[PDB]
Design a protein around this ligand. Structure first.
Ligand code: CLA
Ligand code: CLA
Ligand code: CLA
Ligand code: CLA
Ligand code: CLA
Ligand SMILES: CCCCCCCCCCCCCCCC(=O)OC[C@H](COP(=O)(O)OC[C@@H](O)CO)OC(=O)CCCCCCCCCCCCCCC
Ligand code: KC2
Ligand code: KC2
Ligand SMILES: CC1=C(C#C/C(C)=C/C=C/C(C)=C/C=C/C=C(C)/C=C/C=C(\C)C#CC2=C(C)C[C@@H](O)CC2(C)C)C(C)(C)C[C@H](O)C1
Ligand SMILES: CC1=C(C#C/C(C)=C/C=C/C(C)=C/C=C/C=C(C)/C=C/C=C(C)/C=C/C2=C(C)CCCC2(C)C)C(C)(C)C[C@H](O)C1
Ligand SMILES: CC1=CCCC(C)(C)[C@H]1/C=C/C(C)=C/C=C/C(C)=C/C=C/C=C(C)/C=C/C=C(C)/C=C/C1=C(C)CCCC1(C)C
Ligand SMILES: CC1=CCCC(C)(C)[C@H]1/C=C/C(C)=C/C=C/C(C)=C/C=C/C=C(C)/C=C/C=C(C)/C=C/C1=C(C)CCCC1(C)C
Ligand SMILES: [Mn+2]
Lengths: 45, 163, 163, 49, 180, 57, 173, 35
């Protein structure tokens, strides 16, 4: 059951891959200015 | 430019590609390509499918005596109903082909692909600075396809009732 | 003369073929030497005595027992656990003393203040007794090692070889 | 019993999230990802409903 | 001039005597092509994880939690005997600890952007870094223990895979490899 | 009171001039050198282009 | 014609007396086609392997460990190929040769004498004259063992007898 | 059948994660009127 996960090994792609990409995304996120802007969207990128 | 992920995002959302990819295309292209190749392979050489579930298969493949007009990917078996039927949920590949599993595969990947196409039309409209409501127009054939492929089997209780 | 080995420490004859004093603090080395020597004095005395007295009730508890076999029986009984925990409790404050000595204090290696009989009143007597303690401790290390390995080869105590 | 327990969880989770959103501000990942206007919030509510 | 670790190979250009644990051992030019701070942080992280892993290898053989499924002498089999939900809880907790320690700076381009020193995560409940010489000697001891624990954990894990026996348990009744 | 005592400091029995002891604690070299991708390419060149055969020239 | 070892063949162009054992013996063209440092490194490695091989060929026949069966050296290579000990020896020799690659790369660059690994634990060859004498002895023994190990192996392959077993009861072909 | 399932799960998770983190990378700023 759960997310179609009838074998524990299936949890390895479902966690390691989202984390790894997130780590890459972290290198993006730390680069961006994370201050408030008070606008409809943030043009700083 | 700033980071590897930033370079990947710039390439994905680039307007310099011959065909725009975008984030919606990141989901659209694999699903559409999978559904396309599975549909071609099934239309050419799929085994007959017991659509009615009473052990009388119906042939819809070219190699089994069909032409272009009479050829089709037969809907899933009535014994399956609307149960999720991937390849790994069948005892054998022959059993999966016999119960109309490729129909479910093509239908699901095609619905994901057309949703991605709606989103990708919006995405390229936003990238080009134009108005975004072409995707609203394209929702109607997508709605019709989902009604004839997904909604009607859900209401009737079996993918065998799908088109 | 070996580098890093000054004459300010008693029992020095400039004996250091391997530069242990050049890579390790001499205070730590002298503290370790004195602790090893005192432990070996007690160990050699005990190994000699255990072949003679054996105490009132130990005979029916441990049978006969000897040396390594005595350690093996006593760890199973519980005497070794008690000795280990109490000597570890003492060695906690020994560790504190070593740390304070290395941090800079009036304490010297081997100076635990254990002089209940006031035998250190005469300074020259204490100076002689430091060398006496060092040499008897080194002899005790050699003798304990000899008794241990002689028991390994023959399974006899220090007195069973003599008698 | 499952319905009542799930509604217990939903009610307490909604209370906790309401107090959270009252006492907090959207994080950096949330601020850069969403459009902050009335029509955007309307669209979010529309897809939810 | 010379490495003093391999006296036939010359000192690596990036390995000065500034960093702790530096005996000039870098036969492959990793320091020339990779940041030394990143290399030291990775080395310290691997070694600290291995120190904890060796301590766990000894302790789990010696002591087990009374919870069901937690009673396996062999650590490699104890990984699969323990419920996977607990292991994923551990993984998520360690990931949160890593993210909080680095403050979102998980890449070599930004991990040391604010400095922070290689391997200095701010964990020092006892102020044992006050003395500079003591801190340098403690750094050398930490690096030596880290490398020794890496090698020892590798050995214990592979021997556990071969013999299906816990390390201290395997030391008794040695039973050479061809027996299995 | 946070161990802010003049007598409070760590102690090691090893000599401070022993090999492996760094000159300064917590060294942070600048590394104005090659990027990470060049390092990965160098590590791959270890296995597809090692200096083994250039000696016989 | 001053090769000093073969009087009619002249000294080779780059075979000056800088290297130990340089008697001018290079009739074929090899030092003019390859680097002399690499050639000396290869010569020393071949000779050291051959010296260890000759000593092993003597010792294994004279005494084999309480473990492993009683075997001839070539049969020993085959048995340890199929057992796993040969894989271990190959692994560790390859591990040492991994840094030997870097040493040879240095020798190509410079700052390292060919065949010099600074390996001298017992502190022998004190002073330069003793070092030169030991270098000459090392090179001569290396070449002699290079010939001798091939002699041992081919004689075992032909007569099916080990070397000291062949020394007595010669049994000429 | 398990290996096919793990391959499909890996592929789907990779593509979904790419989609999710791509639309989290300030997608609104990727317009021609952004300054
Ligand atoms: C390194 C020191 C050391 C160690 C590890 C042991 C360990 C052991 N001894 Mg030995 N023993 C020692 C020193 C030591 N002893 C000394 C110095 C003496 C002479 C008094 C003895 C006399 C002795 C006898 C007669 C017997 C043992 C026995 C034993 C065993 C059980 C413990 C017990 O009841 O002993 C009790 C030991 C003592 C009470 C001696 C303590 C003396 C301390 C060191 C005085 C310290 C000075 C103090 C500050 C001044 C007061 C165990 C294997 C027993 C056994 O199993 O043997 C068959 C036994 O029958 N020991
Ligand atoms: C109507 C209710 C409502 C609304 C509009 C919001 C809106 C918001 N919340 Mg709040 N929140 C709510 C309820 C709500 N919250 C409740 C009840 C809780 C308690 C659990 C929270 C706890 C909470 C936290 C702790 C945080 C937010 C944050 C946010 C912001 C970004 C959320 C985001 O990107 O989603 C991201 C959505 C996902 C990643 C998807 C998660 C889906 C989970 C795994 C369940 C999946 C179910 C199912 C399998 C898939 C959906 C099926 C569907 C058909 C139902 C946004 C302003 C964030 C923020 O920036 O604020 C500080 C933040 O950190 N919220
Ligand atoms: C690399 C580190 C590592 C890893 C991956 C594991 C993994 C595992 N351990 Mg082991 N363990 C470790 C280190 C590790 N352990 C250490 C260092 C100890 C000594 C205290 C133990 C003692 C231990 C016992 C007694 C048991 C396990 C068990 C288990 C299993 C279930 C998880 C659990 O209940 O943990 C429980 C582990 C702990 C409560 C100890 C965690 C202490 C951490 C690692 C140290 C943190 C200290 C640090 C200074 C604090 C920083 C504050 C900021 C799992 C396979 C169980 C099992 O199935 O074994 C058969 C079990 O019964 N572990
Ligand atoms: C949510 C989970 C999570 C997250 C986000 C992080 C985040 C991070 N971790 Mg990880 N970590 C976690 C959980 C997590 N940790 C857990 C649970 C453990 C186990 C206790 C670790 C163990 C760990 C180690 C040991 C290291 C990190 C490192 C890092 C940092 C760099 C990440 C990176 O680029 O690796 C992306 C992923 C990779 C690059 C793949 C791994 C590389 C492979 C395994 C190397 C294989 C070498 C090979 C076997 C040897 C060759 C043999 C020869 C014969 C050829 C980053 C802050 C590293 C760091 O700080 O570097 C400075 C580091 O060294 N972490
Ligand atoms: C510390 C590093 C190390 C380690 C862990 C091993 C581990 C092993 N070696 Mg290797 N080996 C090493 C260094 C090492 N070797 C080195 C430096 C050499 C010299 C080049 C060898 C040469 C070697 C040979 C020639 C053989 C092994 C064999 C073995 C195995 C024997 C295990 C056994 O039955 O118990 C051994 C127990 C004891 C020695 C008692 C203590 C084992 C896998 C044997 C093998 O593969 O057996 C199948 C074998 O024949 N090793
Ligand atoms: C399929 C994959 C599904 C992935 C779902 C992604 C949800 C959003 C993740 C962005 C996560 C992300 O990478 O953004 C992290 C974001 C920016 O990170 P930085 O690299 O700037 O690091 C700053 C530090 O505070 C660490 O976050 O940090 C914050 O906004 C403040 C802390 C919030 C931390 C996150 C709390 C809520 C996370 C919800 C999960
Ligand atoms: C140090 C890492 C770590 C942290 C930070 C942490 C925090 C929390 C919190 C937050 C404060 C809650 C609320 C919580 C609750 C539970 N944890 Mg726990 N937890 C951690 C580690 C482990 C391990 C290794 C196991 C475990 C377990 C359970 C079970 C039992 C389920 C059941 O009853 O069967 C429940 C309810 C076991 C498990 O899940 O087995 C299926 C088990 O092996 N946890 N845990
Ligand atoms: C302080 C001096 C002293 C020491 C340091 C010491 C050490 C040990 C150790 C340490 C390794 C063991 C294991 C041990 C064991 C026994 N002792 Mg003993 N013991 C000491 C003194 C006395 C006295 C005064 C008596 C006595 C006795 C017993 C009995 C009784 C039952 C039995 O005989 O079966 C047993 C089992 C009583 C007795 O009946 O002795 C025949 C008795 O009056 N012990 N004793
Ligand atoms: C930093 C910090 C602090 C701290 C701290 C801590 C937490 C310190 C903890 C340190 C630890 C646990 C170090 C552990 C090292 C383990 C090793 C080296 C294992 C080696 C195994 C080997 C060699 C082996 C083996 C084996 C092999 C391979 C196979 C077998 O056949 C044989 C054998 C069994 C021999 C504190 C709070 C104090 C204060 C501070 O303000 C900040
Ligand atoms: C394949 C195989 C393996 C193997 C193997 C091995 C190690 C094979 C190696 C064989 C070797 C090293 C043969 C050596 C030949 C050297 C010769 C003929 C030079 C002689 C010197 C001369 C002529 C000197 C001439 C001279 C003299 C003094 C005077 C004139 C001048 C000068 C030219 C200098 C195993 C055993 C592992 C088993 C496996 O199952 C298969
Ligand atoms: C982050 C991000 C990605 C990229 C795009 C983006 C737009 C920038 C953004 C998107 C974000 C998006 C798309 C966010 C949207 C996320 C969604 C749709 C989250 C759904 C949450 C629903 C939950 C947890 C249901 C709980 C129900 C329960 C407990 C029921 C209990 C029940 C009760 C009551 C009754 C009985 C039955 C039971 C079942 C027991
Ligand atoms: C299977 C399994 C079990 C449980 C489940 C699991 C967690 C999923 C998984 C674990 C997987 C894990 C965690 C696997 C981890 C496996 C590990 C840690 C392998 C490490 C091996 C270390 C080696 C080979 C170092 C050797 C040192 C040498 C040669 C030193 C040389 C030296 C140098 C250079 C210096 C000079 C001297 C000498 C001595 C020459
Ligand atoms: Mn119908």
């Amino acid at each position: 059951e759960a997310l179609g996960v009838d074998d524990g090994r299936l949890l390895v792609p479902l966690v390691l891959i989202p984390v790894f990409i997130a780590i890459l995304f972290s290198n993006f996120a730390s680069t961006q200015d994370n201050e408030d802007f008070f606008d409809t969207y943030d043009q700083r990128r | 430019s700033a980071s590897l992920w930033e370079r990947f995002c710039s390439w994905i959302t680039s307007t310099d590609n011959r065909l725009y990819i975008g984030w919606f295309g990141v989901l659209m292209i694999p699903t559409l390509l999978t559904a396309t190749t599975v549909y071609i392979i099934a239309f050419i050489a799929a085994p007959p499918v017991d659509i009615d579930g009473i052990r009388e298969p119906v042939a819809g493949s070219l190699l089994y005596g069909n032409n272009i007009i009479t050829g089709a990917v037969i809907p899933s078996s009535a014994s399956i109903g609307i149960h999720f039927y991937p390849i790994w949920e069948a005892a054998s590949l022959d059993e999966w082909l016999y119960n109309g599993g490729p129909y479910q595969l093509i239908v699901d990947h095609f619905l994901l692909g057309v949703c991605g196409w709606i989103g990708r039309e919006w995405e390229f409209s936003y990238r080009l600075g134009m108005r975004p409501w072409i995707s609203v127009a394209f929702t109607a054939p997508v709605a019709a396809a989902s009604a004839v492929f997904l909604v009607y089997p859900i209401g009737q209780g079996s993918f065998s009732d799908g088109m | 003369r070996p580098p890093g080995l000054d004459g300010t420490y008693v029992g020095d004859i400039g004996f250091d073929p391997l530069g242990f004093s050049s890579i390790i603090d001499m205070r730590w080395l002298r503290e370790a030497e004195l602790k090893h020597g005192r432990v070996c004095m007690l160990a050699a005395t005990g190994m000699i005595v255990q072949d003679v007295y054996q105490f009132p009730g130990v005979t029916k508890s441990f049978g006969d027992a000897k040396m390594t076999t005595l350690h093996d029986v006593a760890v199973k009984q519980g005497s070794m656990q008690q000795l280990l925990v109490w000597l570890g409790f003492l060695e906690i404050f020994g560790f504190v003393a070593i740390v304070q000595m290395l941090q800079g204090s009036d304490r010297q290696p081997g100076d635990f203040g254990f002089d209940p009989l006031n035998c250190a009143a005469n300074p020259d007597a204490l100076a002689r007794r430091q060398l006496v303690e060092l040499k008897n401790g080194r002899l005790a290390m050699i003798a304990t090692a000899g008794m241990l390995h002689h028991f390994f080869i023959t399974g006899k105590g220090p007195i069973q070889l003599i008698t | 019993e499952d319905i009542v327990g799930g509604h217990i969880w939903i009610g307490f989770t909604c209370i906790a999230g309401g107090f959270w959103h009252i006492l907090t501000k959207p994080f950096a990942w949330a601020r850069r990802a969403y459009v902050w206007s009335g029509e955007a919030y309307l669209s979010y509510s529309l897809v939810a409903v | 001039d010379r490495s003093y670790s391999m006296p036939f190979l010359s000192r690596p250009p990036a390995l000065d005597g500034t960093m702790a644990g530096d005996v000039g051992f870098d036969p492959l030019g990793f320091s020339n092509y990779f940041d030394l701070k990143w290399l030291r942080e990775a080395e310290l992280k691997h070694g600290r994880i291995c120190m904890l892993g060796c301590l766990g290898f000894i302790t789990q053989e010696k002591i087990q939690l009374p919870l069901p499924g937690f009673d396996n002498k062999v650590a490699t089999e104890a990984f699969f005997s323990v419920p996977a939900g607990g292991l994923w809880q551990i993984f998520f907790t360690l990931g949160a600890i890593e993210i909080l320690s680095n403050g979102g700076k998980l890449a070599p381009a930004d991990m040391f952007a604010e400095g922070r020193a290689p391997g200095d995560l701010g964990f020092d409940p006892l102020n044992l870094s006050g003395d500079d010489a003591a801190l340098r000697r403690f750094e050398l001891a930490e690096l030596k223990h880290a490398r020794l624990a890496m090698i020892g954990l590798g050995g214990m894990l592979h021997q556990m895979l071969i013999t299906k026996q816990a390390p201290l348990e395997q030391l008794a009744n040695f039973q050479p490899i061809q027996y299995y | 009171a946070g161990c802010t005592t003049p007598d409070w400091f760590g102690v090691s029995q090893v000599a401070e001039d022993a090999p492996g002891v760094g000159l300064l604690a917590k060294a942070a070299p600048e590394y104005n050198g090659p990027s990470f991708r060049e390092g990965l390419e160098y590590v791959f060149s270890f296995v597809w282009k090692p200096p083994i055969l250039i000696a016989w020239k | 014609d001053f090769s000093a070892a073969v009087p009619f063949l002249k000294r080779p162009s780059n075979l000056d007396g800088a290297y130990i054992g340089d008697v001018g013996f290079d009739p074929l063209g090899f030092s003019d086609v390859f680097d002399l440092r690499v050639l000396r490194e290869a010569e020393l490695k071949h000779g050291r392997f051959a010296m260890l091989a000759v000593l092993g060929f003597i010792v294994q026949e004279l005494y084999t460990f309480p473990f492993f069966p009683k075997m001839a050296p070539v049969d020993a290579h085959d048995y340890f190929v199929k057992q796993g000990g040969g894989s271990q020896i190959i692994f560790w020799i390859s591990f040492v040769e991994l840094f030997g690659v870097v040493a040879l790369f240095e020798t190509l660059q410079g700052k390292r004498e060919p065949g010099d690994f600074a390996f001298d634990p017992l502190g022998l060859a004190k002073d330069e004259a003793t070092l030169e004498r030991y270098r000459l002895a090392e090179v001569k023994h290396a070449r002699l063992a290079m010939i001798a190990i091939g002699g041992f192996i081919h004689q075992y392959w032909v007569t099916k007898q080990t070397v000291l077993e062949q020394l007595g009861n010669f049994k000429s072909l | 059948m398990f290996t096919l399932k793990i391959v499909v799960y890996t592929t789907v998770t990779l593509f979904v994660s790419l989609f999710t983190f791509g639309f989290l990378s300030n997608d609104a700023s990727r317009n021609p009127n952004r300054k």
